[PDB]
Amino acid sequence: GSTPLFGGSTGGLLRKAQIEEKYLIVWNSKEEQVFEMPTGGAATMVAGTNVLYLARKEQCHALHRQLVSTFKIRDSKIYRVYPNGEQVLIFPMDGVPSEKSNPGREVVGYVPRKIGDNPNPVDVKFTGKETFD
Amino acid sequence: QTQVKDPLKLCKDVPAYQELKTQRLEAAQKAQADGKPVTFNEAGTKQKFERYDTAYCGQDGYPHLITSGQLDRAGDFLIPSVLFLWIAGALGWAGRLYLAESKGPEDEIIIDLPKAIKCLLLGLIWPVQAIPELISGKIRVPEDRVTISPR
Amino acid sequence: IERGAKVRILRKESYWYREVGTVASVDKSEKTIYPVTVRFEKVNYSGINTNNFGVSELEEVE
Amino acid sequence: SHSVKIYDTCIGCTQCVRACPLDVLEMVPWDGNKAGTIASSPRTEDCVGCKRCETACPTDFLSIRVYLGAETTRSMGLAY
Amino acid sequence: PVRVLVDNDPVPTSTEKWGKPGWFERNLARGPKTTTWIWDLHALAHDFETHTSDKEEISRKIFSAHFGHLAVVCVWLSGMFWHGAYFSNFTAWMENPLGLKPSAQTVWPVFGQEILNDPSTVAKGFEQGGIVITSGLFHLWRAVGFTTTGQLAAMSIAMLIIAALFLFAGWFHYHKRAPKLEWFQNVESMLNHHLAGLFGLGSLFWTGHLIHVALPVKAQLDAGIAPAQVNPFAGLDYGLMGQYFPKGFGPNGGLGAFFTLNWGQFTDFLTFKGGLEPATGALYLTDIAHHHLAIATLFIIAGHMYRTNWGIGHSIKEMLEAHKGPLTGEGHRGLYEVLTTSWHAQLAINLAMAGSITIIVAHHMYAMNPYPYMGTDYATQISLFTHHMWIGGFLIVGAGAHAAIFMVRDYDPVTNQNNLLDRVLRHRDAIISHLNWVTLFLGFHSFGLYVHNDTMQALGRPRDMFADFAIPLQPVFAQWIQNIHAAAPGGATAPWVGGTSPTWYTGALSSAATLQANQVLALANDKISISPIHLGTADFMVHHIFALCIHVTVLILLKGVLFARSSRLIPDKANLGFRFPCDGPGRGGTCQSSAWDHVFLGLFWMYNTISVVIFHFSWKMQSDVWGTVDRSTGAVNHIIGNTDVLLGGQTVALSQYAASSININGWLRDFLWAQSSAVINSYGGPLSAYGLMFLGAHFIWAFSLMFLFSGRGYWQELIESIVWAHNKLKVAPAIQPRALSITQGRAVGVAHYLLGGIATTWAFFLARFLAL
Amino acid sequence: GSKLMPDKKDFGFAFPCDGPGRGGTCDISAWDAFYLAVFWMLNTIGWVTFYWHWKWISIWGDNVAQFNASSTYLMGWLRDYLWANSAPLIGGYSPSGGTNALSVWAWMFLFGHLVWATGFMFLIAWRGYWQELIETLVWAHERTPLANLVRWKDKPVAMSIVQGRLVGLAHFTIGYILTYAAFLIASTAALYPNGPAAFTPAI
Numbered sequence A: 001g002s003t004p005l006f007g008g009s010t011g012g013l014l015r016k017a018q019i020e021e022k023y024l025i026v027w028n029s030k031e032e033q034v035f036e037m038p039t040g041g042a043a044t045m046v047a048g049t050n051v052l053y054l055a056r057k058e059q060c061h062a063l064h065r066q067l068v069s070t071f072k073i074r075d076s077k078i079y080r081v082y083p084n085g086e087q088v089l090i091f092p093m094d095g096v097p098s099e100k101s102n103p104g105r106e107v108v109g110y111v112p113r114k115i116g117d118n119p120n121p122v123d124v125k126f127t128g129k130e131t132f133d
Numbered sequence B: 001q002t003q004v005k006d007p008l009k010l011c012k013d014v015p016a017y018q019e020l021k022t023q024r025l026e027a028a029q030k031a032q033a034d035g036k037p038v039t040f041n042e043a044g045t046k047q048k049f050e051r052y053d054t055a056y057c058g059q060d061g062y063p064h065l066i067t068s069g070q071l072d073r074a075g076d077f078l079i080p081s082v083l084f085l086w087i088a089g090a091l092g093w094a095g096r097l098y099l100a101e102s103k104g105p106e107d108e109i110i111i112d113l114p115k116a117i118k119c120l121l122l123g124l125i126w127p128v129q130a131i132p133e134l135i136s137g138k139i140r141v142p143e144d145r146v147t148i149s150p151r
Numbered sequence C: 001i002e003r004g005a006k007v008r009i010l011r012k013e014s015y016w017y018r019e020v021g022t023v024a025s026v027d028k029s030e031k032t033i034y035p036v037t038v039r040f041e042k043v044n045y046s047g048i049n050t051n052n053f054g055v056s057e058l059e060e061v062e
Numbered sequence D: 001s002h003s004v005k006i007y008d009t010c011i012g013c014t015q016c017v018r019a020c021p022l023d024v025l026e027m028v029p030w031d032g033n034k035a036g037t038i039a040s041s042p043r044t045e046d047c048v049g050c051k052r053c054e055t056a057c058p059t060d061f062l063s064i065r066v067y068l069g070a071e072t073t074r075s076m077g078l079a080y
Numbered sequence E: 001p002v003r004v005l006v007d008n009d010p011v012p013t014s015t016e017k018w019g020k021p022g023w024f025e026r027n028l029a030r031g032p033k034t035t036t037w038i039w040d041l042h043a044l045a046h047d048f049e050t051h052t053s054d055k056e057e058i059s060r061k062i063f064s065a066h067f068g069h070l071a072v073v074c075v076w077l078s079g080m081f082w083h084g085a086y087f088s089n090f091t092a093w094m095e096n097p098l099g100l101k102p103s104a105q106t107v108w109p110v111f112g113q114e115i116l117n118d119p120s121t122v123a124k125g126f127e128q129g130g131i132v133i134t135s136g137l138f139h140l141w142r143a144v145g146f147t148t149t150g151q152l153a154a155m156s157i158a159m160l161i162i163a164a165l166f167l168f169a170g171w172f173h174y175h176k177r178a179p180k181l182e183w184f185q186n187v188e189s190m191l192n193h194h195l196a197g198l199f200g201l202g203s204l205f206w207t208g209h210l211i212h213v214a215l216p217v218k219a220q221l222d223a224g225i226a227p228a229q230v231n232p233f234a235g236l237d238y239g240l241m242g243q244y245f246p247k248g249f250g251p252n253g254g255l256g257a258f259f260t261l262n263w264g265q266f267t268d269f270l271t272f273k274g275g276l277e278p279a280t281g282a283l284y285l286t287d288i289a290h291h292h293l294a295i296a297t298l299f300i301i302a303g304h305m306y307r308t309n310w311g312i313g314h315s316i317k318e319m320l321e322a323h324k325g326p327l328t329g330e331g332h333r334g335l336y337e338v339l340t341t342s343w344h345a346q347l348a349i350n351l352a353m354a355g356s357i358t359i360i361v362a363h364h365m366y367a368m369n370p371y372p373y374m375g376t377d378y379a380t381q382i383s384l385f386t387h388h389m390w391i392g393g394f395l396i397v398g399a400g401a402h403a404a405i406f407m408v409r410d411y412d413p414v415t416n417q418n419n420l421l422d423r424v425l426r427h428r429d430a431i432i433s434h435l436n437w438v439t440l441f442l443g444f445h446s447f448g449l450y451v452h453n454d455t456m457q458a459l460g461r462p463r464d465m466f467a468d469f470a471i472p473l474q475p476v477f478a479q480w481i482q483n484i485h486a487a488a489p490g491g492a493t494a495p496w497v498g499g500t501s502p503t504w505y506t507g508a509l510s511s512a513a514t515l516q517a518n519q520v521l522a523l524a525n526d527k528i529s530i531s532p533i534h535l536g537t538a539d540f541m542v543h544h545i546f547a548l549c550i551h552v553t554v555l556i557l558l559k560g561v562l563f564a565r566s567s568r569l570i571p572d573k574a575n576l577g578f579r580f581p582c583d584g585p586g587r588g589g590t591c592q593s594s595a596w597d598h599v600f601l602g603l604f605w606m607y608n609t610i611s612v613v614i615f616h617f618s619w620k621m622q623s624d625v626w627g628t629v630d631r632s633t634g635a636v637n638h639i640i641g642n643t644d645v646l647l648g649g650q651t652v653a654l655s656q657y658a659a660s661s662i663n664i665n666g667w668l669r670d671f672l673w674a675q676s677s678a679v680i681n682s683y684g685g686p687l688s689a690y691g692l693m694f695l696g697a698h699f700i701w702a703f704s705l706m707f708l709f710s711g712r713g714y715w716q717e718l719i720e721s722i723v724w725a726h727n728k729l730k731v732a733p734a735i736q737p738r739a740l741s742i743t744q745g746r747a748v749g750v751a752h753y754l755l756g757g758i759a760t761t762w763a764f765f766l767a768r769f770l771a772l
Numbered sequence F: 001g002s003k004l005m006p007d008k009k010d011f012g013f014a015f016p017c018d019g020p021g022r023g024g025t026c027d028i029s030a031w032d033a034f035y036l037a038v039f040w041m042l043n044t045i046g047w048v049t050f051y052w053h054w055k056w057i058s059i060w061g062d063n064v065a066q067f068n069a070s071s072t073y074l075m076g077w078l079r080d081y082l083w084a085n086s087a088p089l090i091g092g093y094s095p096s097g098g099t100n101a102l103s104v105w106a107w108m109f110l111f112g113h114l115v116w117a118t119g120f121m122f123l124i125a126w127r128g129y130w131q132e133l134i135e136t137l138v139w140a141h142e143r144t145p146l147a148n149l150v151r152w153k154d155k156p157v158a159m160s161i162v163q164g165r166l167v168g169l170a171h172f173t174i175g176y177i178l179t180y181a182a183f184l185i186a187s188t189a190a191l192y193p194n195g196p197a198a199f200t201p202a203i
């Protein structure tokens, strides 16, 4: 795929995108149409596969939210790109959207109690253990 | 530092009050003949210093109030105290009466006037109703029906 | 406890603690931890007027 | 990274998952509520701590809790 | 294509909705459950776009609300003429405009507040006296030809009829004949009618009032006729018009000279004088009449530029699409669609212009006084400059607000593709970082000079100061501009202009201390109306302070506009709206990142800006311009009067502004401490209301800091314990008490900060100049 | 804990807020109540020390009748205490009379006004304004020739929400104390510096 038609801006990638991580968002478009860049300004998506390099995951997820709400484009994929060149898919992780429940995911962050039954901070004094355990 | 053994005496004995009293009456007689309509005319200023004559004054000549409960100065604080607590208690009881008879939150933004005048009239005699609700515990909600926060 | 009855809240972190709500729904199923739905006269700080409670967090006053 | 914990009062309404601008959250199947599902926080290394998930949570006192922890480049929201 | 499309009776006129406040918005129509609903009702009541998505219904509400506002202004104007007619000393002031203080508010005698009625306003017809007014209304009414109070009463009645006409048309054009959306989008027809009809014929009809009322009334008062004896219809009799103006109304007839193009007869009552009349300190009325005649011609001409229904004229959309270049992409394309579909885009422009014009009014009125004897009314001059400076500053901030609201609500990427708007957003980091740099440059190199001077003076090193007596910073570009305009009347570039403002004539002087009486314009009361205004080191320094405060205010408001939709911090900020408190404590913390919060912060910097401007105006005019002349020595005695700068100790005489305003301690001691002696000693006399307002405004300002410095989570928890006590005694209300929202707490804080700070200076200024 | 935040102890003494939900929760921590009460402590001790100073300089200056007359209304405090006793202080240096020994207190008095007012910037203009401003400066540094060769080791960010309150309180407090100390010392040492203190005992 190719980049969307955009004349460039000052709101895009900085040296972090060369040395630490940048992000890649991939989507398919059926019609050439104009969308707002998260960097600032207007760009046009091609009639094909679109690839766009962005600075943060939140900028990628904001564009995905715009591509869903305004253009009904669903199949957006977000990759984390490392400076050696490795791409790691980060969104969506298991192919099923996060809002729909899926058999096969592990429950992470579960605390088997209501929030007012957390222990007191005096109970966990002089340890790195927190009261949300 | 200079100790004031006699901070207060009757105003009619203080010569700085006699300064002020003649200085106010002369300004009131100045505006009666060839003058302007003023708040304190000549008869209004006579009555003003008729009241202040049996008051306590400092050395500046201005009346000072005694709020210790002493009964020759009961007009200074004690009699305005009963008049306040009756009128403020009336407005408080009337809002409490109107709140109990409220249809909902719409009665709080659109005042129901014949309900409000009646509660404001019933509030006027509030100690007829309040103290028989104050010894009964009818003035207060029991403790397990009022929300509190964690401890 | 059943639907329609007035109940007091014993959940201490609840906004409606020691207040009286009305049971709107009781989940007839097992496995559900907080099955009783209670509706209240006061909204909380989010404008929400209902919540789910276990039977162990309720006091029937009716 | 912030800690995002989900407590057993979750009714499976998925509103915190939809609210999250970083895709930290997802629904896994559960048996503790009638919906049969509960929010989970597998990707809290992307959590910025915005607490939009807590704003969306309808349960008296909330079933999802964000504890602001150690700050990273991701969690501080830095594009640089 | 320009038609009139109108729906007939779209809204029934009924009082059913008055039983349900908050019907217009879907959250509020569910009734109050918390006290947040009460504040939400007021904040949303005029936000017509939140009430419906129909653009036509929004345009109808705006048009009808505009009639209601015009009716409010006409009621206010009717009240001013009424209080001038019946509650004023206008009759006695007309005989003695330089000896009596104008008063048009008198005070009932209860609680002793009739002390606010003062002598020096007491005269016949106004026996009890009243509050000295500083609005300048008597000078305006006398200038346009009012001589009696019975004429002011007829004007009060006329303004109530115009108000009732305006209020009826608001009912009519909303409830009876409401125009369609395509009627409002006729901007070419609207510009044609407002340029030629409103501005053009408004100025032409005002010229006719000036020619036939204001000129002959002034001719009779200059003849010595008392204003009770002045015939106001004297400009309608051609014979009586003949005696005042022999050439323009002569045997060579008046309208005969017009149609034969013999307009040189009219130079009796239409001139090009320029300067001020030496007796009144004001502009010539024949200049004012020729001004309004010339700008009526140009405005009526300007109102034929745009094409409506007869082929000829310009199309604005085709004009905007043609003005593009390589450096600017598609140029002005799409801006026609912006400006004819966004009410906020039009309001942002029109507030930017109205605020900037009001500031131009402030500068031009002190320097080119249009009203006789007003230049010696120093409290009026101070008040009118300060009032219009504040109005202009508030409107410019509103321009920044509604530009931001446009960016959140009405911006569309499809309309703005590589046009001017799209390309500004694509280098917003370049714009704001350069604006960040220039504010830091200006702040270091202007305020740091004051701090340098404070420190050098305290260290005993006055030769190391930036001052006229020390290292000078002459404003040589402004002095050059003054030299050009001093030479220009009679000179080469304006040969038949007879004069200009006296402020320019600073050629020819190196300080205001060495000013003689021949150079100044003093009236018969020996008070200086206006003078040459010397610009030295202190004026260099304070003008770069002005540039600092304006650029920071621009920086805050433009950052709010350019980052209203997104930032590197919050990429989908536009989905949160124009007005949101934050996006939570994450990303380090995002408090006040909304575009609304930039308006909030920009109001303080506007406050800081206008406060320096009016403080500069007050001290500079008192030290360098205003004062008295002596008929011996030709000596100019300014209001303050000539500090001696030690320096050696061979003393150096400068004006007090030039000697003392160059450091902050001079502003604290010689301006704020010295001139507050009027307001803090005002008790027991008629300026005692200003002393009360001075203290009360300090209180309100301090009270604002409770809101600005705290957060609502404290107050909500405090309300919890108080609601407990009301719950415990069956006095809890159904509308649950909530702390103010985060945004409202900011809005309450800035409103009380602005109210307290501005009213302090108001009390300070008016007690200073009405006492001396 | 409270009704707005029942699990507040799990978050500690000092934390910014719990976000804009539940109506908004700025300044909900116990630390923030410390921060609010420092203003009220400074105000209270200000009232205490104003009262001590004016009553004693009226004693030292033989002006007790002026204190007894003018301390009963707030203009008397503004005029007869603040305005009158500022005169030797703000005349500590001047273009007309040079400098004297009070010039350091005059300079500190202005310094204290400046520091106190600088505190208002931190107390009023909160973090998200400054963070977006810093990101443009970060852009400017990385794009500027000869300067982009120099790189920070730690990424510039705006001060935290709690830090903005603490730094704003610190400037407010330091400016409060330095202003009053400059006023208290210079007004006393110039207008009322010395007195007898011997007395005749009473019987």
Ligand code: CLA
Residues within 6 Å of the ligand: B091, B092, B093, B094, B095, B096, B098, B111, B115, B116, B117, B119, B120, E721, E722, E723, E725, E726, E729, E731
């Ligand atoms: C029905 C009216 C009513 C009544 C009986 C009370 C009673 C009380 N208030 Mg409450 N209060 C009220 C209205 C009322 N309040 C309102 C409208 C507000 C918002 C301004 C408050 C804010 C408030 C605070 C912050 C505090 C109290 C406290 C208290 C308690 C001590 C007395 C006091 O401090 O008053 C002070 C009263 C005010 C500050 C508000 C007075 C404003 C007006 C006069 C009341 C409105 C009258 C109402 C419109 C009348 C309608 C009647 C008509 C329809 C017939 C007492 C239980 C204190 C407490 O908790 O002590 C334990 C306390 O700290 N009140």
Ligand code: CLA
Residues within 6 Å of the ligand: E011, E012, E013, E014, E015, E017, E018, E060, E061, E062, E064, E065, E067, E068, E069, E071, E072, E075, E163, E167, E168, E169, E170, E171, E174, E175
């Ligand atoms: C003659 C009586 C009259 C009646 C019965 C109505 C009735 C209605 N109007 Mg209409 N309207 C009228 C006159 C009237 N109007 C006039 C004179 C104007 C020109 C200003 C309008 C312009 C107008 C607009 C733009 C809108 C309405 C709307 C409405 C509907 C709801 C209004 C509401 O509930 O808010 C309650 C409002 C009040 C009780 C009054 C608020 C007054 C504020 C606080 C001050 C306003 C100043 C005033 C306009 C000028 C006074 C000048 C001077 C003489 C003092 C309701 C059918 C709304 C609608 O139909 O939406 C679909 C709507 O959007 N009206």
Ligand code: CLA
Residues within 6 Å of the ligand: E042, E043, E044, E045, E046, E047, E048, E351, E394, E395, E396, E397, E398, E399, E401, E402, E405, E578, E579, E596, E599, E600, E751, E755
């Ligand atoms: C022609 C001028 C004009 C017009 C038509 C508008 C119109 C609007 N503005 Mg804009 N604006 C303007 C000028 C204007 N503004 C100016 C000069 C400023 C700078 C202050 C702003 C800054 C601004 C902001 C920051 C916002 C708006 C908003 C709005 C919209 C809703 C207004 C509302 O319902 O609030 C309701 C009005 C009130 C509740 C009354 C306001 C009372 C003020 C704050 C205090 C008054 C005190 C007074 C000065 C002194 C009284 C003291 C005495 C009583 C003791 C409406 C589109 C809001 C919006 O969201 O747009 C979509 C919004 O957030 N405006």
Ligand SMILES: CC(C)=CCC/C(C)=C/CC/C(C)=C/CC/C(C)=C/CC1=C(C)C(=O)c2ccccc2C1=O
Residues within 6 Å of the ligand: F121, F122, F123, F125, F126, F127, F130, F131, F157, F158, F159, F160, F161, F163, F164, F165
């Ligand atoms: C300690 C050390 C190693 C120093 C080395 C040597 C160095 C570089 C000295 C430089 C120190 C300075 C001056 C750093 C700039 C501080 C800054 C980011 C201020 C912007 C800011 C303002 C104005 C607020 O009002 C505010 C309110 C609430 C929350 C956040 C903020 C906020 O962020």
Ligand SMILES: CC(C)=CCC/C(C)=C\CC/C(C)=C\CC/C(C)=C/CC1=C(C)C(=O)c2ccccc2C1=O
Residues within 6 Å of the ligand: E706, E707, E708, E710, E711, E712, E715, E716, E738, E739, E740, E741, E742, E744, E745, E746
């Ligand atoms: C006609 C008329 C006037 C009737 C009287 C009307 C009746 C019945 C009640 C009157 C209630 C009114 C008018 C005001 C109380 C507002 C309030 C909860 C203030 C506390 C508060 C303070 C002090 C802050 O600093 C602050 C800072 C930042 C965010 C939030 C807050 C905050 O919430």
